[PDB]
Structure formats: structure tokens, C-alpha cells
Design a protein around this ligand. Structure first.
Ligand SMILES: *[C@@H]1O[C@H](CO)[C@@H](O[C@@H]2O[C@H](CO)[C@@H](O)[C@H](O)[C@H]2NC(C)=O)[C@H](O)[C@H]1NC(C)=O
Lengths: 48, 44
């Protein structure tokens, strides 16, 4: 099972790591069952 | 999950991902929201 747990928060800093404590509710539990060793991050850029 | 007890309207608020709810002693208290309160018993 691949469990993804998610949370959203409004923060008012510029460049820091927010303080405090927040619970992380379960968003989804995909029943996939695959082997994962390496992962990437997907970014959206801008063009003009 | 089988048991014996009284079904009662629950004022507590659950979550969409939560189905069961256990209080202290790890015993069944609420089941999906309905509270489980065992019927009266005691000594004589
Ligand atoms: C997921 O795949 C990786 C391959 O990159 C597995 O890692 C190898 O596992 C074998 C055993 O089957 C070892 O002999 C190799 O030395 C491992 N290589 C590395 C780079 O770690 C990994 O075992 C797989 N995981 C699962 C759960 O199947």
C-alpha cells in the first residue's frame, strides 16, 4: 500500500520553516504494491 | 465486529477517514456516528 498523508496551512513568512505543531490527516491510501527506490519532484516553470 | 451494548446518539465529531473509535483501555466505544454504551449491570 502507498499511503499519502496531506495537510494544508496558511503561513506568513518570507523564507523560513514554519514553527508550531500540526496534525497530518490521511489523504489517500493507494492499493498499488510496487517497488520504489528513487523519486523526483515536478516543478512548473514560467515562460514569456 | 460483534458485541453487546446500547446504541446512543453521539455528540463527538469523527473524521472521514475514521471508522472506529476506542477510548481508554483500547475497547470499542464508537462505531460508524453511534456511541456504544453497555447496558446497566452491577452487583446484587
Ligand atoms: C527494488 O529494486 C531494487 C533494484 O534497484 C532492489 O535492490 C536490489 O535488490 C537485490 C535483491 O533482489 C540486491 O541483490 C541488489 O544488490 C539490490 N540493489 C540495490 C542497488 O539496492 C530492491 O531489493 C527492490 N526492492 C523490493 C522490495 O523488491
Amino acid at each position: 500500500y502507498f499511503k499519502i498523508y496531506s495537510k494544508h496551512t496558511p503561513i506568513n513568512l518570507v523564507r523560513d520553516l514554519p514553527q508550531g505543531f500540526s496534525a497530518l490527516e490521511p489523504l489517500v491510501d493507494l492499493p498499488i504494491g510496487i517497488n520504489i527506490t528513487r523519486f523526483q519532484t515536478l516543478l512548473a516553470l514560467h515562460r514569456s | 465486529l460483534t458485541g453487546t451494548g446500547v446504541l446512543t446518539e453521539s455528540n463527538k465529531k469523527f473524521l472521514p477517514f475514521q471508522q472506529f473509535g476506542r477510548d481508554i483501555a483500547d475497547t470499542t466505544d464508537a462505531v460508524r456516528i453511534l456511541d456504544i454504551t453497555p447496558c446497566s449491570f452491577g452487583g446484587v
